[PDB]
Design an enzyme around this catalytic site. Sequence first.
Site, PDB file in Angstrom:
ATOM      1  CG  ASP B  94      -1.829   1.236   1.339  1.00 13.92           C
ATOM      2  OD1 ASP B  94      -3.056   1.131   1.035  1.00 13.92           O
ATOM      3  OD2 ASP B  94      -1.303   2.309   1.743  1.00 13.92           O
ATOM      4  CG  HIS B  95       3.003   2.408   3.178  1.00 14.82           C
ATOM      5  ND1 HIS B  95       3.623   2.531   4.405  1.00 14.82           N
ATOM      6  CD2 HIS B  95       1.665   2.514   3.365  1.00 14.82           C
ATOM      7  CE1 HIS B  95       2.651   2.683   5.289  1.00 14.82           C
ATOM      8  NE2 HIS B  95       1.460   2.678   4.711  1.00 14.82           N
ATOM      9  CG  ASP B  96       5.469   0.059  -4.632  1.00 13.76           C
ATOM     10  OD1 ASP B  96       5.672   1.078  -5.319  1.00 13.76           O
ATOM     11  OD2 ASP B  96       5.974  -1.055  -4.904  1.00 13.76           O
TER      12      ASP B  96
HETATM   13  C1  HEC Z   1      -3.061  -4.008   3.500  1.00 16.72           C
HETATM   14  C2  HEC Z   1      -3.623  -2.911   3.960  1.00 16.72           C
HETATM   15  C3  HEC Z   1      -3.238  -2.066   5.110  1.00 16.72           C
HETATM   16  C4  HEC Z   1      -2.643  -2.390   6.287  1.00 16.72           C
HETATM   17  C5  HEC Z   1      -2.200  -3.749   6.787  1.00 16.72           C
HETATM   18  C6  HEC Z   1      -2.539  -1.198   7.040  1.00 16.72           C
HETATM   19  N1  HEC Z   1      -3.126  -0.137   6.405  1.00 16.72           N
HETATM   20 FE1  HEC Z   1      -3.565   1.667   7.135  1.00 16.72          FE
HETATM   21  N2  HEC Z   1      -3.880   2.264   5.291  1.00 16.72           N
HETATM   22  C7  HEC Z   1      -3.922   1.480   4.186  1.00 16.72           C
HETATM   23  C8  HEC Z   1      -4.165   2.282   2.968  1.00 16.72           C
HETATM   24  C9  HEC Z   1      -4.225   1.786   1.520  1.00 16.72           C
HETATM   25  C10 HEC Z   1      -4.414   3.524   3.429  1.00 16.72           C
HETATM   26  C11 HEC Z   1      -4.604   4.769   2.585  1.00 16.72           C
HETATM   27  C12 HEC Z   1      -3.229   5.311   2.265  1.00 16.72           C
HETATM   28  C13 HEC Z   1      -3.193   6.699   1.686  1.00 16.72           C
HETATM   29  O1  HEC Z   1      -3.338   6.931   0.495  1.00 16.72           O
HETATM   30  O2  HEC Z   1      -2.963   7.743   2.475  1.00 16.72           O
HETATM   31  C14 HEC Z   1      -4.192   3.514   4.872  1.00 16.72           C
HETATM   32  C15 HEC Z   1      -4.281   4.666   5.617  1.00 16.72           C
HETATM   33  C16 HEC Z   1      -3.888   4.672   6.911  1.00 16.72           C
HETATM   34  C17 HEC Z   1      -3.930   5.820   7.785  1.00 16.72           C
HETATM   35  C18 HEC Z   1      -4.472   7.192   7.465  1.00 16.72           C
HETATM   36  C19 HEC Z   1      -5.901   7.255   8.133  1.00 16.72           C
HETATM   37  C20 HEC Z   1      -6.675   8.479   7.738  1.00 16.72           C
HETATM   38  O3  HEC Z   1      -7.732   8.300   6.927  1.00 16.72           O
HETATM   39  O4  HEC Z   1      -6.346   9.595   8.132  1.00 16.72           O
HETATM   40  C21 HEC Z   1      -3.446   5.428   9.001  1.00 16.72           C
HETATM   41  C22 HEC Z   1      -3.291   6.224  10.267  1.00 16.72           C
HETATM   42  C23 HEC Z   1      -3.092   4.072   8.831  1.00 16.72           C
HETATM   43  N3  HEC Z   1      -3.490   3.528   7.621  1.00 16.72           N
HETATM   44  C24 HEC Z   1      -2.336   3.415   9.733  1.00 16.72           C
HETATM   45  C25 HEC Z   1      -1.993   2.067   9.606  1.00 16.72           C
HETATM   46  C26 HEC Z   1      -1.279   1.395  10.638  1.00 16.72           C
HETATM   47  C27 HEC Z   1      -0.810   2.052  11.922  1.00 16.72           C
HETATM   48  C28 HEC Z   1      -1.204   0.113  10.268  1.00 16.72           C
HETATM   49  C29 HEC Z   1      -0.624  -1.032  10.954  1.00 16.72           C
HETATM   50  C30 HEC Z   1       0.590  -1.053  11.457  1.00 16.72           C
HETATM   51  C31 HEC Z   1      -1.860   0.039   8.958  1.00 16.72           C
HETATM   52  N4  HEC Z   1      -2.394   1.229   8.620  1.00 16.72           N
HETATM   53  C32 HEC Z   1      -1.951  -1.126   8.270  1.00 16.72           C
HETATM   54  C33 HEC Z   1      -3.774   0.094   4.110  1.00 16.72           C
HETATM   55  C34 HEC Z   1      -3.424  -0.659   5.175  1.00 16.72           C
HETATM   56 CA   LIG Z   2       4.991   3.135  -6.525  1.00 19.33          CA
END
Ligand code: HEC
Ligand SMILES: [Ca+2]
Lengths: 464, 103
Positions: B94-96
């Site tokens: 997701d971070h890629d």
């Molecule tokens: C496989 C999916 C997945 C996992 C596992 C995941 N996330 Fe998410 N998360 C996302 C995605 C995709 C977004 C949206 C990213 C963006 O474009 O900003 C997101 C957004 C977030 C946001 C922004 C929330 C907001 O709407 O303001 C936070 C905080 C967050 N994740 C924290 C975490 C943390 C802490 C973990 C665990 C260590 C985690 N995420 C694990 C996919 C995941």
């Molecule tokens: Ca990329």
Amino acid sequence: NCETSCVQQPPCFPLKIPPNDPRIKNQADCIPFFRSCPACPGSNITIRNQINALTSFVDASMVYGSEEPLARNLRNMSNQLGLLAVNQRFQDNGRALLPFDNLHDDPCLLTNRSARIPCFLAGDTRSSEMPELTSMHTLLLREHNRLATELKSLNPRWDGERLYQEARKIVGAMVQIITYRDYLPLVLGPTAMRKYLPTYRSYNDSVDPRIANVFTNAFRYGHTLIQPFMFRLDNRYQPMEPNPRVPLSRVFFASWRVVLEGGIDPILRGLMATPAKLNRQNQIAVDEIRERLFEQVMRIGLDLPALNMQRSRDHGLPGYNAWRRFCGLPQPETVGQLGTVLRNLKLARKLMEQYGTPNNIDIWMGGVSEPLKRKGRVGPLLACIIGTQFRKLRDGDRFWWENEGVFSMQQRQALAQISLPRIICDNTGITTVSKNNIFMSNSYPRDFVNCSTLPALNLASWRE
Amino acid sequence: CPEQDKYRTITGMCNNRRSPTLGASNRAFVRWLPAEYEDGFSLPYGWTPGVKRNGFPVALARAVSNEIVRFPTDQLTPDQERSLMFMQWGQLLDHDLDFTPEP
Ligand code: HEC
Ligand SMILES: [Ca+2]
Ligand SMILES: *[C@@H]1O[C@H](CO[C@@H]2O[C@@H](C)[C@@H](O)[C@@H](O)[C@@H]2O)[C@@H](O[C@@H]2O[C@H](CO)[C@@H](O[C@@H]3O[C@H](CO[C@H]4O[C@H](CO)[C@@H](O)[C@H](O)[C@@H]4O)[C@@H](O)[C@H](O[C@H]4O[C@H](CO)[C@@H](O)[C@H](O)[C@@H]4O)[C@@H]3O)[C@H](O)[C@H]2NC(C)=O)[C@H](O)[C@H]1NC(C)=O
Ligand SMILES: *[C@@H]1O[C@H](CO)[C@@H](O)[C@H](O)[C@H]1NC(C)=O
Ligand SMILES: *[C@@H]1O[C@H](CO)[C@@H](O)[C@H](O)[C@H]1NC(C)=O
Ligand SMILES: [Cl-]
Ligand SMILES: [Cl-]
């Protein structure tokens, strides 16, 4: 300021507190929230949209960066070896650690005042959010340096830029292989895998490779897999005492835990040998993220599932039924209809009590509520959005590892032998890793094998 | 936009040659459905007190989280066929793909 005020004035969109809240007794308080940056600020003509700050391609941009100045700073510019820069103050038992960032307001310093360990610097800015993510960034940083060292011995005439680009191309291919061969089949299940991701033919320049706005919310399904602790295991995969299980509220931004509490090896062991949380319709997401998200660095603990719902509204995403229609899936109009879709009337009832109509159910909420597909961890709706997105990233990627001209027939044959457990053997002191598929294997020592048994990536076809 | 190239650009620009910003960084997301805002173009649903969405009041995200998401931690069901690595790879992946900037 969205951080300290509860006033709803742009760009703040604070989450109000309902009566009889299990944690926030003060109803004049709120959960802080900043609206995502608009693509067109202050416009009375354009329908508000949000920005993607990263390259949509599965190209290891979380390692290399998505902007040229950052990408340059992440490289070891001191020599012509084509490596990435590493931490100068610390090492993990002689192994490399990510460099430190130069933030003015550093949240990692607040997690342990005594330690004074700042955030790490990586391709993506969220590298220090949880030490399990930091461990994966560190693993991929070591793999780049390992590849550029192997390639320098094979091709001494190659300069720094050639070595960097060749090692970058291999790292990106490995991210694509692990994702499409090992990860996605286990997310979608086999029938959805065949439907949304048929056998790759070739690159098609009429396939839009951009990330859809909905995917930024739909892919947050992964929040239902999160465990409430960070598990650390010693050399024999036994709990690393003291503190073998540390609550998530104590690990957010805790980069000091990587530097001082044993490095990346016990974290990687814990990720491999601990089962994931199973998403169940009555056990959707844990309170470490629902109540104590970033608790240590904020004035109040955030609610990750609620932030997701407020985010979909901020992003102007249509509700459940509109996305079910988009996917060609039946759209329930009542609690009776929705009970049939979810194969669970008690959840349909709870959803109808909040939303009133399935048209208004927030996309993350409706998506994580659907029953899981056979051998998959998402339902039909999320399988469609996720599946559709990943086909666009594969068929719309001119540098897709299988596309003719990217790699030679022999280099593709060599790249097919990679695996995530092998990448761990090559870059850590871990000698016993998960038996493939690494995403399914989760019990020590039943699902584990020795590092010697796994074959390495042969770089022979990379010589000039 | 070069006619022949061996490697990706850092920004992703020039991957698609007919529209060279597709997939590139710092660009608006594609939309698969028209956006739904309280005023048609910018205000989110829930912004204005009493403004219903599709004939129904907008539920508070915290209230939805409290009644539907909340559950006793001691009840957690471990996944017999998935590791925490399955969770962690998804976050790394997701971070890629996407990062939505904030003010
Ligand atoms: C496989 C999916 C997945 C996992 C596992 C995941 N996330 Fe998410 N998360 C996302 C995605 C995709 C977004 C949206 C990213 C963006 O474009 O900003 C997101 C957004 C977030 C946001 C922004 C929330 C907001 O709407 O303001 C936070 C905080 C967050 N994740 C924290 C975490 C943390 C802490 C973990 C665990 C260590 C985690 N995420 C694990 C996919 C995941
Ligand atoms: Ca990329
Ligand atoms: C290269 O990829 C192109 C994109 O393909 C899509 O994405 C990939 C990743 C896959 O998922 C694939 O399944 C997707 O299609 C692909 O080009 C596409 O090809 C299809 C089929 O030719 C085109 O669909 C046709 O569209 C016209 C126009 O209307 C469309 O757009 C409007 C507005 O958005 C919509 O309201 C419509 O619903 C349509 O989506 C239609 O008139 C047409 O349908 C009619 O004709 C067919 C028979 O010809 C009948 O079966 C129908 O019932 C109708 O009578 C099609 O639906 C699509 O528009 C086109 N997209 C682009 C971007 O060009 C291309 O073929 C791939 N190339 C190779 C070599 O593989
Ligand atoms: C650059 O490479 C040399 C040799 O590997 C190493 O000693 C030095 O620490 C590196 N510098 C950075 C900033 O990574
Ligand atoms: C902070 O780090 C030190 C090591 O420098 C450790 O002894 C201490 O227990 C940590 N404190 C907290 C609150 O975790
Ligand atoms: Cl440093
Ligand atoms: Cl969309």
